[PDB]
């Protein structure tokens, strides 16, 4: 993405931005899954009727991962749009 924002580069015109954009999205997607997967598991932990309030505290880190992952995704999206615009300009 850094090489694709003008340079000094790339020398992969646009194409690079599209690739970079997907990678950020995938990165975000992976992050969303990992956080969720980890999260899903703890909530189920039946223990067992008078908890969950109660029970534990949870995330925590999750929250951050919940925010960080989201942020990452957003960034990826932005990158993708940038590449798209670049592509448009070339055409």
């Amino acid at each position: 993405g850094l090489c694709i924002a003008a340079s000094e580069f790339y020398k992969t015109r646009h194409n690079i931005i599209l690739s970079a954009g997907i990678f950020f999205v995938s990165a975000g997607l992976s992050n969303i899954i990992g956080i969720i997967v980890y999260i899903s598991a703890n909530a189920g932990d039946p223990s067992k009727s008078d908890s969950k309030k109660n029970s534990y505290s949870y995330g925590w880190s999750f929250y951050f991962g919940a925010l960080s992952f989201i942020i990452a995704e957003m960034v990826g999206v932005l990158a993708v749009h940038m590449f798209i615009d670049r592509h448009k300009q070339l055409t």
Binding site: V80, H81, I84, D85, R86
Partner: peptide
């Protein structure tokens, strides 16, 4: 090109806010 991505992101967000044959985005 940057605004063209904003107008589209708002269009896909409208295609998101729920309700041709480009097989890719079709499925």
């Amino acid at each position: 090109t940057n605004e063209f991505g904003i107008f589209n992101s708002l269009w896909f967000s409208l295609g998101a806010f729920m309700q041709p044959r480009s097989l890719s985005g079709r499925i």
